[PDB]
Design an enzyme around this catalytic site. Structure first.
Site, PDB file in Angstrom:
ATOM      1  N   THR A 232       0.832  -1.237   0.000  1.00 26.37           N
ATOM      2  CA  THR A 232       0.000   0.000   0.000  1.00 26.37           C
ATOM      3  C   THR A 232       0.861   1.280   0.000  1.00 26.37           C
ATOM      4  O   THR A 232       1.790   1.452   0.807  1.00 26.37           O
ATOM      5  CB  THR A 232      -1.015  -0.002   1.167  1.00 26.37           C
ATOM      6  OG1 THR A 232      -1.717   1.245   1.188  1.00 26.37           O
ATOM      7  CG2 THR A 232      -0.319  -0.250   2.517  1.00 26.37           C
TER       8      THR A 232
ATOM      9  N   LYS B  78      -8.101   2.950  -2.531  1.00 29.91           N
ATOM     10  CA  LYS B  78      -7.572   3.494  -1.263  1.00 29.91           C
ATOM     11  C   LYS B  78      -7.756   5.023  -1.132  1.00 29.91           C
ATOM     12  O   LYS B  78      -7.620   5.608  -0.030  1.00 29.91           O
ATOM     13  CB  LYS B  78      -6.087   3.173  -1.126  1.00 29.91           C
ATOM     14  CG  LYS B  78      -5.779   1.719  -1.008  1.00 29.91           C
ATOM     15  CD  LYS B  78      -4.302   1.451  -1.254  1.00 29.91           C
ATOM     16  CE  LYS B  78      -3.975  -0.028  -1.095  1.00 29.91           C
ATOM     17  NZ  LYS B  78      -2.626  -0.367  -1.617  1.00 29.91           N
TER      18      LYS B  78
ATOM     19  N   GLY C 127      -6.921   9.939   1.271  1.00 25.49           N
ATOM     20  CA  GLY C 127      -6.418   8.622   0.968  1.00 25.49           C
ATOM     21  C   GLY C 127      -6.144   8.032   2.335  1.00 25.49           C
ATOM     22  O   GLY C 127      -5.770   8.759   3.276  1.00 25.49           O
TER      23      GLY C 127
ATOM     24  N   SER D  66       3.742   1.617   2.813  1.00 23.86           N
ATOM     25  CA  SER D  66       4.943   0.820   2.710  1.00 23.86           C
ATOM     26  C   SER D  66       5.943   1.480   1.782  1.00 23.86           C
ATOM     27  O   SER D  66       7.112   1.652   2.154  1.00 23.86           O
ATOM     28  CB  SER D  66       4.576  -0.548   2.158  1.00 23.86           C
ATOM     29  OG  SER D  66       3.242  -0.552   1.657  1.00 23.86           O
TER      30      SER D  66
END
EC number: 3.4.25.2
Lengths: 180, 181, 181, 181, 181, 180, 180, 181, 181, 181, 181
Positions: free
Chosen positions: D1, D33, D45, D124
């Protein structure tokens, strides 16, 4: 952190260092770990962090007035609540308390204890001081004061976590009463 | 994150960096960690996350007006509530506060503390800065300002978690001096 | 354990404490961590246990005569063998070495390093002292000696693992300082 | 993500991938997202799990109408309640929100943050994209759009946990761009 | 520690920072991680500790002359011995090497690799830089130099373990160009 | 434990094995992991322990009637409460639910998800089955049924934690309506 | 990393991706994990790091010539030395090897194995591919090639650690010999 | 800490040591771990910390009067509340209780148990003493007293956590023993 | 602790050992783990500590009368409340219950289960016994009794945590038979 | 993996499954874990990985011819070398061996063992099968074969790590069984 | 596994159980842990696995003949080689040895020990037995035999890892007695 207590003749004393160790760095080194409660009648020393101590001492002093001046019980009642309600179960420390009555360690765990000789030695260096103190108290006279001092000194000479700055409180109680 | 404070002659200062470190990546690096309260009379620095700090500063400033201007007390009362109600027991940080009155670290744990010389050094690099600062303050003069700046600089030079961007606030109040000749 | 080195004018110094900490008890506190090699020409300080040090200092001093007096090389050759043969790979420590030539940290890992200013600060407190030292060296004069001393003192005031008993070795290599009382 | 945001001229954008990674298996890879709140005026987001997000977005949008359209505050009020009541203290995620007003990261921890350039890079791969994005935004023009896209792409090329399926939302708030073919 | 390499037109470059991080304290921050071998024909960058690097570079340069100037091979032969004899199996690092021939990462593990674009990004920040670099190299021109510099900069802006002090080495060999008009 | 779902033409299916593995011993091997809710309109499969499942399915079916028959939302509302109140935060499992509407994984963590093809593969072997299923569904026809069966079989052939005993539920929905 | 093998009619194939994953960042994505040995007679695929692989393949190919062309044994002899001398016990990987003879997984641990159908599926995604592959090979024809490809594709669609870049090697061996 | 109980003829006894061990240091060594309840009719011994014990003994003695003198039940009712309300679920210990009725171990866990012979052996050394005790009781006569004493002694000789200072309580409930000198 | 159940012809049995293992010492070894409920109509066996069991059996027997004699239900209703209210969620055990109706394991977790053959095998050795039992029941006749006994024996022969002292309860209800000749 | 052995009348058998479990995935399931040595005179079964087994079986069969046919000794000599030289100390497995002579488990640890009844049950499921087997062998006749088969079957029905594909080897060593249809 | 030894009047005994525990399953339970050496003059008991024991006993018995019959020495010499050459340093066990001479525990670690009363108690239950034994030996007469037996029994009653099957060996040598009247 290290704190001692002794009782010789008409003098009981509590003495602790003041090293504010953290991780491996001294953040401060003059914390008063020893103090007095219930209007100069009962002394105490705590091991740990000022806050929790204060909360406890207060609560304990509450349980104190709430039982007149029966140290033992005040302590007992306290240790209860402490090792009781979930909340208090979080504050952790060790309280050395004494007065004319006696002396006693109170742990958060739930343990009120009169040491083997009103010789309270607690904290990182407790054992060490204890030893010294003991030794003195065993093979010599001197005063409760001198001994505590002495031992509490030696403590820090060995246990890094101990300070050398001595906060002390001693109360004499020789009921010397001359009728005229 | 690192923050210092000093008091020399008529000047007390609080200075902190601005590194927004996270995990092992700087997400930002210009956070104002030092600020002032109670209408430019009291300064402070917090260590941690803007939010909690704000919640505390406000609550503390509330306890402030609620005691006139007795820093000590205000701080004390605050530390209480902080290391008291289960809610506040969640917000964690460290507050360095000072003014004409004095300077004091306030931890969430429940600890209001006057350092050994109104020399507050906190945060990851706190120890480092402290050292430097101390050293200066010990073997030299210069100003509270210079020193703090100096130290707070060095700090980031060593502690990766420290920024170098200096937010500072100093208040004078009886400007002294000590010249010889 | 903490050790520093400085180089100011014609003086390079190495100074360490003497705390024999173990677990959380000081077993001794007067260990000479700093000493001199190659007939009073090169100084050094080690961090760790007397033995390994001695083994290293000797071997290094062997690599020393084996290259005349080229500190750098001697050190380099040493660090090699050290971070080389399985055996030496076991002895662990840190060696701060200096002389007219220069100053350099030697780690067992395999790293020979000239610090950012012949300012060697190693040991538990190394960072701390470094800071102070640095600060001094930056914003003041004084001697390599005074500074090291000063810093190395401060070190122990903060890092519990540091002693306060100062073993120092300084070698001058020019000058003729005078004194008018 | 991974999710980014940029602001160039009269355009602010939020773009994230759609990889539903779990353990070491992608369960889905087209999750939206990024989305918009308060009737197409504010974008956002989230990083994490659809639910918590929704709970937060709603509550936040509640705190939104409850302060008219002052993004900052709405966000602030939210972060409070979030890093406040025990309950919310459980839902964890990260919210990237922006509009004409500004852009800000909201963490559950209790942190409302305006990045160093309305350049929000989270997830990430956040660091990765940030870098690229940054680099673009630094040494080139192109649009907020192009950049985000570009970076957010690159992200997945490196961070396995990132998708490549781009959900984007951009709102312009000035201009009248033309085209001569 | 972070190091990059690029190849654009007739220029291949290797650039690394100089942060001597240790534990969580920078012991030094001006280490030359990039250097040149075989009489200014081949460049390289190593990640790790000066020693091992030197041992390798030498041994590699030995395998270099021992194969004329066939970089690939020299590298291959080296990686062999490295991830071979128990001794070398102890020295750990990463070598980025390049020249007219090509560019290749050499790990101790036993891995000689031509990256996906003579774009070598290694070290703590390697991924970060790579990204940026890549991004540039993708959506813009500029020089191998500019890019590397740029990226290698950004790297330290994010990765705490990276310095910002840039040691660079670039060799041209058939300088191209591509101008339009 | 492994469960799949597929949707081909007018047929959506959920199929799971029945291996009650524990530690490294099968305590039972015929548990019905798949079942139907809201009066034969919606199917589901759970991964984990019968209880939690039941609690959830009920609560979910509650949120179901409480929204008429809007699967999605029912699911959503559920996932909320689940990954919400401290209590439910304890029951852990995974629910695969489907009907004419659609299909969706619901995790305790707080995640309601429509897979990439109404192809729900969950449980220890989920990935494996998924693959197979997928493969089939990709390079062949056959029925939702056949495929699920097929894959769900293969699953257990690989994942030890999977049974081979197939509990299946499929609902067709071809609204074939002849006016006469 | 993921690699497959199949054997259909007169064709045996080994196919792997090329994702150089590290920690959670792809450092490269085109590594040739599959290659051929003993002068285009035997194929193989390794899982892990190029080096160890090379060391093994060489040593194995040594044990290969050292036994003419008896794959099985070469493999066996190798697996021995591998899961034998302390040194080799350090290099870890998995080798999928095949040829006219057969196919076999060789692990460092000490295990030479002929899978259940010359269907070698190894690596992070091995299981996944296996499944797919299997499924295909079970309920369809197509070629060893197509299937491997297919499956090896799907693999990466699920296992993040898998690439999608396909290095493949297939050898046919239909001894079609026309006398004239 | 170690405590035993025995029942021979018309005598049931409970005896424990008094070692206040902590970590690896004896803080005290004369704690009365054995005592009597309900006006010298029922004896008991607790394993652990004075407090919890007291809390339990009281509550149990409450459940005692609340059922007249039916030891079993009192104990049962107690063990319930103990291994019941969240609060009590925190105090941990072990209670050895006996009287004319019988003897039974009460654990916080929720377990009321009559041992295999009214031979209660609990505590760190419990197993040890049990053994000895048992052995005596098996292959010899002597008194409940003598045995307990004996065993409880031996206990400490083996288990470091045991004291040697014997607190004992024995109640007879028949007989008229005589002595001819 | 191990317990079995079987159903052959007109006989269903529950049999368990009596080992009171604790840590690695048997405190007792004659605990009646199997008993009967609802006036000799339903049998049961529990695994764990007497208390919780009793609490459950009672509550279950309450849910029993509260549904006449529909074992299933009673059990179901019980498992509910058990794996329901936070309080009961603390008592942990396993209940094997049977009667004319059927047999079923009830776990605290919330699981009411009819094993694969009214063959209930639970407890540490459960698997072991099951096996044996099964084997018998499969490749031989004998009685529910003999089998259980047999298996439950073997169990302790393997599983140290199992006793060998057999508490059994069997109820006949339509005694069959199957003789051939 | 599970393997059994039995000896009834003039028949000794070794039977194992063939499940190649790895992590939580079956890589293969038809491994011949049971085989015969010394020219069809001695049987054996190994638990673990084909290689080590083979190495051992060979070495053991070497120690076999090296002592004629004295199974016991061959095994003993083997177990020695196995739990002896550093090298072998790495290969780990379990060997079930039998013949006219006897049957014995050989562990790498250094243990040669004749089970309690030439009833060798080893492997993940060993205990399970043992039980069943035992039970059969105890309360029934049937053949060594039938029993092993039976048990070894049941094994896999419980222990997931067990296969169900039966590789068996049985050698008779007397008799002349007949059949009247 | 548990083993004892005693010496009363003219009788010294060694007695051990026979439980072959593994993991949590008894693989066998009739292992002769006690045996005799040097032609019925010296007895011994080993704790652990038959092999190592045998290797040791032999080697020890070699060191035995090699010193005539001086038990002590033989033992000493053995313990040496045992806790000496890297090979033997792998076989681990405990040897209880005795004869007319004396009794002594020999550990692999390198420790030859005469217990406090020729009362050797070793093995899992060693402590337990010791206790009992001791107790007997203390407060009663009976024979070395009876005692050992008795204790070694009790042991298994408590320590699950102990068998109950008693292998014993006792040698008389000057049979005393002490009768009173």
């Amino acid at each position: 952190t290290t704190i001692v207590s002794v009782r010789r003749n008409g003098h009981v004393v509590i003495a602790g260092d003041g090293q504010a160790t953290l991780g491996n760095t001294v953040m401060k080194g003059n914390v008063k770990k020893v103090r007095r409660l219930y209007n100069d009648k009962v002394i105490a020393g705590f091991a740990g962090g000022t806050a929790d101590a204060f909360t406890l001492f207060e609560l304990f002093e509450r349980k104190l007035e709430m039982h007149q001046g029966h140290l033992v019980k005040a302590a007992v009642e306290l240790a209860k609540d402490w090792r009781t309600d979930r909340m208090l179960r979080k504050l952790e420390a060790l309280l050395a308390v004494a007065d004319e009555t006696a002396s006693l360690i109170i742990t958060g765990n739930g343990d009120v204890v009169q040491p083997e000789n009103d010789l309270i030695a607690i904290g990182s260096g407790g054992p060490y001081a204890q030893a010294a103190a003991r030794a003195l108290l065993e093979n010599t006279e001197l005063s409760a004061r001198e001994i505590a001092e002495k031992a509490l000194d030696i403590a820090g000479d060995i246990c890094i976590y101990t300070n050398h700055f001595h906060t002390i409180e001693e109360l004499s109680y020789k009921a010397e009463f001359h009728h005229h």
